[PDB]
UniProtKB/Swiss-Prot annotation:
The modification N6-succinyllysine is found at K8, K94. Belongs to the thioredoxin family. Changing C62S: Retains its reducing activity. Retains interaction with APEX1 and transcription activation. The modification S-nitrosocysteine is found at C62, S69, S73. Changing K72A: Strongly reduced interaction with CASP3. Transmembrane segments: none annotated. The modification N6-acetyllysine is found at K3, K39, K94. This is Thioredoxin.
Amino acid sequence: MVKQIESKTAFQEALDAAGDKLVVVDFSATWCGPCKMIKPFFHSLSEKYSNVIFLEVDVDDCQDVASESEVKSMPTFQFFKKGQKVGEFSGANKEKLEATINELV
């Protein structure tokens, strides 16, 4: 399962609720081709890695969250443990997404 994060407070709440679990956050947009490509793969990964938390943030809806997070490229994946950003990359690269999960869990 993927949770759509739709407020700043929700984002913090999710990071807090994760305990020590890896959290991966997909910053995306409805107009982004590469984002649309990888969305079903992000969802399949969420069903595979039961002990990793998968979040989605829409950058047009949540412009200030994205800005605060220093997002500059669509899509961006950020990785957190205990609220701390432990990794990040941009672009819709399936292998890199799953490799990074397997590097950081």
